[model samples]
Target: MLSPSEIPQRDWFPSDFTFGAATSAYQIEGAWNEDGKGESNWDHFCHNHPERILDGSNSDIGANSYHMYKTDVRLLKEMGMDAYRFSISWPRILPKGTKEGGINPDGIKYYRNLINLLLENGIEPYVTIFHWDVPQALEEKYGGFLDKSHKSIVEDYTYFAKVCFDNFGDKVKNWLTFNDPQTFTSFSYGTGVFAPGRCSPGLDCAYPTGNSLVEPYTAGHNILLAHAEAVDLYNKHYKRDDTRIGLAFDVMGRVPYGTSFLDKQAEERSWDINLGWFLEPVVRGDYPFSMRSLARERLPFFKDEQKEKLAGSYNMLGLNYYTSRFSKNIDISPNYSPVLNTDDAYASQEVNGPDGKPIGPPMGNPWIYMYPEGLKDLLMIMKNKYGNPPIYITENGIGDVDTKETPLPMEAALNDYKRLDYIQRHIATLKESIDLGSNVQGYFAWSLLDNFEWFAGFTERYGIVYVDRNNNCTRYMKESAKWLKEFNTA
Candidate 1:
């Protein structure tokens, strides 16, 4: 076995490889329900459905980033990051998610100023339109993604994005249409474990009835449509040869527990459904056969016009991956259900997650394991399956267990050696992918600051900068941050 130092490094990636960090509005930009910030789906999800979060805590205060963004920027500066990927809160921009005078100058001001600040600090800004938080008004109006209004919403939001682009796209070199379409659908629709918490009828949901999970498909379809529409808008009005616009999809692998036919089938199903759900539609202009067979006409198909729009909607591919799981195949058992959340055809066992961290005890979250090699597997899969498009590792980071009284210790927090190791290994694999002509363009770590972990409440800390719970929201740079800065230059 190769020691960590024995890991090979190829000068495959180009000199201008993009190295950056990522963050979300709600996760870091606190000010939840403040500054006329309309209630987001997350705000409502946390306040109304306390049972969803692991810690049962609401993001009412979150990271207080609304007031402390300057501090957050300073943290990024210390990291020597080339780019900062952050999302604009829909609710913050338009509280009720409508163009009927829904625009908030203050909200626009917040993002505009942020873009200017990042540029001023020699950091490019990567803006994501939707990071799982939509204006609650849209959810109430057309049942959110449950309804087909996402098409119209996309048009409106496209116009909305144009405003931002006109104002800041000059300095911002990159944009992401949406972040991880499947995770949002599964959590929001299937498990009802996330915002707009409602059950779905598909594989895994609070209620796996016909109507339950179908909503996520509708949501996903609309997400893709919205993405296509936004891309069209950007292409028509704001395409730049130097800048880029892309879609972010969650990519995790599933290996069979055993080499049996059933296990092999389960593994295939896991790969297809998990990775192919949105990508096939986005790249190839249709749903995966596995998804189509499982949904059985329940999930809708894209129309001809929609197909053309989605065919080349993205200029690049942004991947948000954590880890993979073990697949288990089973026969047609009437009484037994396969794994939920996983594709309907297979079940997964807890082998390892993102970086192959030991599963002996509880890890960050059950859904995510630690399997660093999964990164290589996922990259190769992307290269082989999708024709090796220019790709970016948009989000990948380890979240440690956090608590109130005592949380991640200084050594673990400041010097997140595990995290540093994971990134370095992943970087090596990414370089391999590039060498193989994958056209891998960039790598952006999951987050820059520790903030609200959605349904986990604040139980999981996935940031290079530790945020204390003492209400000061004090930020401390972890060892990973320092290593990341040097790794890119080194």
Candidate 2:
């Protein structure tokens, strides 16, 4: 554990570095069907298949940010945060998911109100245009991202983004085209654990008509095209301002399982599928060579025009890092058959190294291990392997389990010293990365308040501020939040 004095102070980071918090629409903003907001895939999923969620719950009444956004702004101001990253629910703006349905003015007013309050408090607004809340209407009409053709998801998504720019571009200077396309496509289309769950037959997913191995890549391909199109629009029409735009990737830092050459090669392939699957297309105008060859006809290729738009698509890069893993090589024999689209990487990620020890300390979630070193190492790779781009730590945080039958006592919940230490250590590592010329510029903690955790529901609490659902989702600052207030004030 790092001592308070050993933890890097605020002054250790670059003067321009940003510190903030993030929350997605579906995660925090309830009122899933209120204010003329169209039904999102998530709403339909939770209602239609409550069994899928761990606690059989929905986000119909989440932290209620839709109704209590002012309190959220005050929390940010009190914490001395420089920015607030929140996503706009597309269905809220375009009720039917397309321009044909006409714009929803009340939805617009709600977001404008939230944005205005943040600006009033002197906090910069970082808006994510689409954060995995696809309009159920779009999914019904053309299979959502599964419709790889440019005439459907790409067309409507670009229009939705245009509407955002037209309405809020003046006040909001930072924009993210997508939250995490890799996670969205894979979980929604491959594993079928997420909303609009679709997978091959025999899987636990809801709609079993989808080819799990193929649809993930197909959906991912369209997501990239939509990002490229939306970015092109923003650059062409909205570049007048100093606003920055980029795609936020959900990346897990990784290493070779052993000193063997195959493990090193597997490590590269692992990065190719996880980060490079989308990063390469934007930076170099195509998918990684490994993907093109391995996925073969299953992967979609960009048209020459699309390629032109994709090249150098972003002015900045957003990375949502949580944990690290070791990549172990698996032989791609002639009889090899992949069950999931992600298996194209032909590598297996292990929590333990060859010596059979965990890479880092285990956190609350079974997946996220406390490994700050992985973050610094990944930053180095970003600097050396890929051209160093302006970057933001868009999302990073650990969780505390709070079950229905056995919830942690309120006193214990607020005394989250482990989380406090986790964040400070990462903040310190960010300084190390910056000193090593990683081009990192900002950091946004995972959340401001504990809300819905998708399939996990309220079982996983990742917020620095605890939201007491027992009494109308009241917000309470945990030890981590208190420490952050002190650090920012200092």
Candidate 3:
């Protein structure tokens, strides 16, 4: 076993082990309103609810990658990445999430340029259609993904995505249908807590005012439809045995609270109600049995056409494994049930260490814990349940706020050993999963450059390449980037 910081010298990974970095438009593209862009949920959220943001910062001036994408691509080359994964702002394309108004040719033009540039530089572009920044117009008109119109809108979005396929299919091969459906929806509904704080305020235990469960529930339903439509479009028209379409999901490994049988059952129930809520329909073309039995809602049955759309909707699977937590079954209290509508669906229980200190490692933000081994466990679980679908680590990295800012000019000499440890431990566990016949294909770091972390704002840093937040968009490869270059080569 390799220490957290030490790179294993032994050869354990396949040559096809892909290495890359990732970023999103909201996090990197600072041209939030430039070039005829319309309002998104995020745009409205930050402007209206300043109190929602943890650090009270907005992406209006993120990394400014729109004008600085070339530099980002250069950093990709510097890190010896195999691909660059990013999100396409929906409003950037439709401006209002509808096709009736003439399509934003300017938005299409910009992405065309970026795609061509990435190809020219020999880096593959893996793009996502939506990453939580729903067009505010759609929400206002149809209640966004949480409402019924969201289903049809997703089909429209898929058709819009097909347009992207028509334009860039020649160059970009791998396309992620969605990025962490759980995180994005959770943030949208106010359950997960991020941009677009839509959760019922101060109504913690009760159904929120206008606390419509249908919105996010509908939103999630539409997301699967959208993914299926995108995949069908790709497979029916574009897939030529080489190109691929897939869905990315956020996951955490679960363990029973104790040796008790009911406790184990509770943990598994939590997993079903939480993670499997979205995954079940996609992987099995139906909701998990656990969820259907526990939740009286019948788990939202899909029509035959919807099932067909969902079954083969993916050519690959994108998994983002974060920290793990100890889970135990609890009585379904009157205030909350083990369902999406319930307030305490999956409660976070603390672990008491030998010294009585918390067991999980340090995390700047909530929801993340440091349990490297969890990655391998989740990999095995996914393989066992999903029949060994090809997996890619689409978004997995640590965030920090304490590290002293490092200078860029002296790049080679600088060292970010902490981030290095994150990569090493994660990659090591990933390698172990591969040894167990897990059909893991690639590993893309969560971010290549630190831009604006949503909610956390500019306060947190996760990029291997540090960005100058105050000055003209200057990017400096942190010591972690240098190590990634070397480790990837090895």
Candidate 4:
């Protein structure tokens, strides 16, 4: 491992490598119901199930980026970022989640202005078509992506994608079809912490009527179909030589807990479920063989044409990596009934290795256990296992936790040395991966400004630029952002 002080410089990466930051609409854009904007699943979920959120807080006035997006672009410029990755809220454009539902002109204008502003400042915009905030109208209409009931899943999502391309494709060259489908499907349908929460009967969730074991797979299957259809639409209608499209995967790198053969096998299985579950389909046109055998009837099948549509679908791949875990084997019994889709892997993820030591230093966020080597390992795995596809480290960062019990002063928050260290080490590791020929082309920090962090609310600050909620959502560049600006300039 490189010393913490062995920070990488701008010249360490290729001249074409893009460095930027990302934010989703619901997390940053307030004005949730303003200007003809219809309610999203999140808007409905937070309003109705405030208790589900950590601080009983919602994103109705998140970072207020909806009104102050020009400031957001200015922040990117000040940071010397090359691009900005942001999402277009489905409800914002198509209030009812379908073109037939009537497009909201003001909503379209909002994104157009945002994109124009980004380009005006010489910052490219990487557009994410749908980012979790599904139109609540669609969910209420036919259960959203769990569209086995209506079979309108692919059509609605494809229409949305086409609408985006028709309107913004001329300006936005990099399009991500979906951001972290695994996290969205699993969290929303499996464990049920996210919006439109649902889980199997008797499980702990906001709505216990869902089949946790089945619904996640069902939702995931539809997402794959939707992605395939969207790619086809883009290829057919919006294809340009310079345009690139792909999916963003939320990958938590896994290491075997022990040197035992069982643990090694468990690690492979963990990768299959965590990363390969979504990636394998886009790469080779089907779910992993392990998944097929284990999930059996629970997993869906694809037609020959659909498989053809899925394989080699992406021009690039976006990996949203944060941390790694140790995968330990678990015995499966005949009577074992799965509560979550991940249970099928028969592998348990533990933060500690066989030595009983944590994988790396703990970030302020309880879930992340930092292990920079894991990023390199994952990139290598992508090279060796997935045919060396072009990759972008789309989302990577640590969050600072602030709660009533452990409040952080704004003055102290501005000097974010830990975040700087985290990002610096990761970038150094990326340099190693690129040197090893991982086909990496870009790196995007998880966020540009601190915004509403879903169930965690505003307590977890992941942004390089801090957004002060107590003071008109003023922006302050943390030490990390300042260091990054200098690095880019140098």
TM-score, every prediction:
0.90, 0.98, 0.91, 0.98
Give the alpha carbon lDDT tens digit for every residue of 1-490 in model 3: 2554567432467766777888888888878788988888888877776666666678887888889888888888766788888988888887888876547888888899998888888788888777777778876887677666546577567767877788778877888878877667655564535545555545332224433244455567788888888887788888877888887888777766667887777677666656787777877787778756554462356788888778756778888776776775566667654333432344445453325554466654566667778788778877897678888998888775622353233342235566666777788888788889889988888878777777766666788877766578688777778778777666
Whole-model lDDT, model 3: 0.72
Superposed model 1: Cα runs more than 4 Å off: 1-13, 200-210, 333-343, 347-364, 404-406
Tens-digit lDDT track of model 1 for 248-314: 8887767767668888788877777777888888788888898788776657877898899888677
lDDT of 4 by residue, 288-350 (tens): 998898888998899999999999999999999999999998877877756698898989899
Query: Could you tell me how far off, in angstroms, the CA of residue 368 lies in candidate 3 after the best superposition?
Result: 2.7
Per-residue alpha-carbon lDDT of model 2 for 303-339, expressed as tens digits? 9998989999999999999999999988989788888
Q: Lowest lDDT 10-mer window, candidate 1?
A: 202-211
Query: Candidate 4 at residue 319, lDDT?
Result: 95
Q: On TM-score, who's better, 2 or 3?
A: 2
Predict model 4's lDDT versus the native. 0.90
Q: List the residue pairs that clash in candidate 3.
A: 145-219, 146-215, 266-329
Give the runs in model 2 whose Cα sits over 4 Å from its true position. Answer: none
